[PDB]
Amino acid sequence: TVILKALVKACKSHSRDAQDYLDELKLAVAWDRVDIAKSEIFNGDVEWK
Amino acid sequence: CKGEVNFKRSKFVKVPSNVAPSMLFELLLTEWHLPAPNLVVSLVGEERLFAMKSWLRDVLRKGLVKAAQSTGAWILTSALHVGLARHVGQAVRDHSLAVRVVAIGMASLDRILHRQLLDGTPIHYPADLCPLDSNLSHFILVEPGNDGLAELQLSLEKHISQQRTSSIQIPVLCLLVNGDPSTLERMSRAVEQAAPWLILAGSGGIADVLAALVGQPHLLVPQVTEKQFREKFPSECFSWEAIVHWTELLQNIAAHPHLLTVYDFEQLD
Numbered sequence A: 001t002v003i004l005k006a007l008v009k010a011c012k013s014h015s016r017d018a019q020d021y022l023d024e025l026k027l028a029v030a031w032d033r034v035d036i037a038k039s040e041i042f043n044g045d046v047e048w049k
Numbered sequence B: 001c002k003g004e005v006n007f008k009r010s011k012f013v014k015v016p017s018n019v020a021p022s023m024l025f026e027l028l029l030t031e032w033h034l035p036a037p038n039l040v041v042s043l044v045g046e047e048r049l050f051a052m053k054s055w056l057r058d059v060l061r062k063g064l065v066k067a068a069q070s071t072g073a074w075i076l077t078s079a080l081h082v083g084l085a086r087h088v089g090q091a092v093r094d095h096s097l098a099v100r101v102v103a104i105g106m107a108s109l110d111r112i113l114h115r116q117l118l119d120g121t122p123i124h125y126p127a128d129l130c131p132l133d134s135n136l137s138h139f140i141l142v143e144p145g146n147d148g149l150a151e152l153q154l155s156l157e158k159h160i161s162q163q164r165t166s167s168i169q170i171p172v173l174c175l176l177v178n179g180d181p182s183t184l185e186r187m188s189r190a191v192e193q194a195a196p197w198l199i200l201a202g203s204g205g206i207a208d209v210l211a212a213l214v215g216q217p218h219l220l221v222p223q224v225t226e227k228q229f230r231e232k233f234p235s236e237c238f239s240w241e242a243i244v245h246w247t248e249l250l251q252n253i254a255a256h257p258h259l260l261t262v263y264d265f266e267q268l269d
Helices: A001-013 A020-029 A034-042 B019-033 B054-068 B083-095 B146-160 B182-191 B204-211 B220-231 B241-256
Strands: B002-006 B007-015 B040-043 B075-077 B104-108 B138-142 B171-176 B197-200 B259-263
Touching: A001 A034, A001 B083, A020 A034, B007 B019, B019 B146, B040 B146, B054 B083, B075 B083, B075 B146, B075 B259, B083 B220, B104 B146, B146 B171, B171 B182, B182 B204, B182 B241, B197 B204, B204 B220, B220 B241
Parallel strands: B007 B138, B040 B075, B040 B171, B075 B104, B104 B138, B171 B197, B197 B259
Antiparallel strands: B002 B007
């Protein structure tokens, strides 16, 4: 959990964009931590299409 | 200056500023044959850039729908909404198809697209500088100053907060949602009109900073206001003079803490 938390922290810190967060989210799907991960991602300012 | 636009026939009236609010209100009531509203609420924020917080927005929309389906109320959003208000308007219209509340849109003629065409009767505006939507089943148009429009809306508000006319008084509420800096000055004009305000902690930068500013009563805090504006939407730099001028309006608004209060929604009727 904290691993993914720090990882998405890094992804968001560098930039705010789809594709990189997409890869991180693919990882999240791998671990099925939909709750915390989707909270971190989609409650954010980032826009998805 | 009544006009009917054929697209769903939508009615509107062209009225300049400093026109009788009693006459405006009664003409509108008589013309469109609306029922007397229990409550009126007014939208104040039109920052299209500030996207609605998805869960927060869904919660607000559900709460408004639930309240409005039973008691009955009126709305005061802008005309030809294209930003954040645009999509909420279409969602409310969708709800309307499946006691009644009628959304109202008010705007100045200047920014409206086809404004020359409208000034000169099927009116079609199929735009995918402001296009209209079916959210404006009834419309409100003005063609006079921006402060003129602010005082116009304020006069309509104050006249709705009127006397008996078995005294009946229809409450009016203002909703401030990630507005412009001008909205702040606008709120000043409402502060003198005894208008109960409502702001949101997480809606956007302006409301969030206002949650702190008035809460901490500082006579002189120009650098604090500067650091706050830089924290919240530092898109364009502001002159220290204008910052002191807005700080004056902050001192004025905070002086009336009873009429307004903030609640943390991310943290109803």
